[PDB]
Amino acid sequence: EMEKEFEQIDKSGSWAAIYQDIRHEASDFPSRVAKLPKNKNRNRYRDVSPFDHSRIKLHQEDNDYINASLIKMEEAQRSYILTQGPLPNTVGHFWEMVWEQKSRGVVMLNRVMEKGSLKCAQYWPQKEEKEMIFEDTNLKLTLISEDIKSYYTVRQLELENLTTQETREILHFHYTTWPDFGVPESPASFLNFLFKVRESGSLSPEHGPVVVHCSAGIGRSGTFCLADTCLLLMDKRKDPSSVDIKKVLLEMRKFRMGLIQTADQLRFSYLAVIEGAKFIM
Ligand SMILES: CCC(=O)Nc1nc(C)cs1
């Protein structure tokens, strides 16, 4: 059981060691499309690339590339799109992907500015009466409502395909309190946020996969998917304690490199799953 594994690693301070074994065992697949010179300005970080086998393709004939991966967790019946925070020049591609994949929710785990630098373009409207038009992908985005809470904001957006005049409602879940350095002290507000996303129907199989992002789409975004999938497997299995976090993480790393960036994020993922298991047993 993970609770006892947690105390062992914590009392022995072996987190950096566990983390390094995960790094060593992780899959490595080609990412040739990401490294084409015509895609250089579609990547925020030169060392963070989607694998070719799991990359999301845009339905535009010119250039189908976006820095985004489909993570398919077969046993949990959960899919996620993990992507980078959009760049000034990829905001149109971002919303095209949302439209094409039939996503109902966007989960954002970063602030636009952190540590005095821009981590993400401002890719949604700040006011009801000032809608955004993405001329390159022919989409219009309107803010419908905004509910600001202590730890997160939920926004109701209308996305309109200007080509077909179809409209969809998208929910934007913005976790606003992840600290600039390290991880939250307690996983309580992160779990509360994860339950809120679940309650919305955004993670349900009726819809396309949820879009999850931070700045690179591997660290905080990794923690989100890892916690959700681990808690769902504990509901599904005859024996909840057969769930090995390390195995689940390695299965997720087949689909996108680098998920969980630090030993601290790994420890936080254990704590989130351990605490979430109480509200589930
Ligand atoms: C007021 C904004 C808001 O909370 N919209 C939501 N709709 C659902 C279904 C969950 S949250």
Side-chain angles (χ1 to χ4, degrees), residues 54-56 68-74 76-83 97 101 103 105 107 194 197-198 202-204 207-213 217 221-233 248 252 255-256 259:
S54 54
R55 71 183 183 96
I56 300 294
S69 309
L70 181 65
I71 297 193
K72 275 180 306 198
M73 304 297 292
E74 208 172 73
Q77 308 201 228
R78 212 69 128 199
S79 302
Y80 315 92
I81 293 169
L82 266 59
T83 189
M97 173 176 71
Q101 302 299 317
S103 310
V107 174
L194 170 57
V197 179
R198 279 187 172 195
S202 290
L203 293 175
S204 294
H207 298 295
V210 73
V211 175
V212 181
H213 83 79
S221 295
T223 298
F224 182 85
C225 300
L226 188 55
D228 182 51
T229 284
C230 285
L231 289 168
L232 199 63
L233 289 175
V248 178
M252 292 176 29
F255 296 98
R256 189 170 176 84
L259 299 182

Side-chain angles (χ1 to χ4, degrees), residues 104 145 147 154 171 196 200:
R104 165 70 173 159
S145 75
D147 183 11
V154 183
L171 300 177
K196 255 303 319 224
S200 78

Side-chain angles (χ1 to χ4, degrees), residues 175-206:
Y175 191 80
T176 55
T177 51
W178 193 294
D180 270 29
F181 288 95
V183 299
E185 285 210 273
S186 139
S189 65
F190 183 78
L191 286 171
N192 188 62
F193 178 73
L194 170 57
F195 296 143
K196 255 303 319 224
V197 179
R198 279 187 172 195
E199 283 180 9
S200 78
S202 290
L203 293 175
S204 294
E206 293 66 26

